[PDB]
């Protein structure tokens, strides 16, 4: 079982540019449902962004839209979020979520739908 090693958290003043990486070893030769979920202190898990590598379509949340970006590395089993212009509101622990796909029709946006989960971390200050 692979733990999806990730890094790229930290904390800076709201409005900076942060970069969070997530790679899935053993997923180099497959398509998957790469996505991310926020967990605010005292709140629930909120979908943030995701990519469908089968069709190569990247989607973002309505609040998230136009502010977050997903970049894919040379290695197929690796993507990153670039988050610029952060807010005091976005202080939430991030969780990388992965689900391997072959047909890859639609990109799930629910927490329960993803199989292989992570334990990432992210906090933000004003």
């Amino acid at each position: 079982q692979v733990q999806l090693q990730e890094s790229g958290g930290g904390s800076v003043q709201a409005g900076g540019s942060l970069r969070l990486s997530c790679t899935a070893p053993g997923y180099t030769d497959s398509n998957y449902y790469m996505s991310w979920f926020r967990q605010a202190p005292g709140k629930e898990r909120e979908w943030v962004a995701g990519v469908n590598t089968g069709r190569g379509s990247t989607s973002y949340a309505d609040s998230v839209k136009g502010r977050f970006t997903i970049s894919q590395d040379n290695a197929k089993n690796t993507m990153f979020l670039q988050m610029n212009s952060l807010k005091p509101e976005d202080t939430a622990i991030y969780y990388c979520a992965v689900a391997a796909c072959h047909f890859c029709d639609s990109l799930p946006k629910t927490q329960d739908e993803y199989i292989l989960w992570g334990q990432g971390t992210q906090v933000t200050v004003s």
Partner: peptide, 15 residues
């Protein structure tokens, strides 16, 4: 297609 994609992902817990 959706079910196949799900079962494949479940199996891919140990690539």
């Amino acid at each position: 297609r959706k079910y196949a994609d799900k079962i494949y992902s479940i199996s891919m817990k140990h690539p």
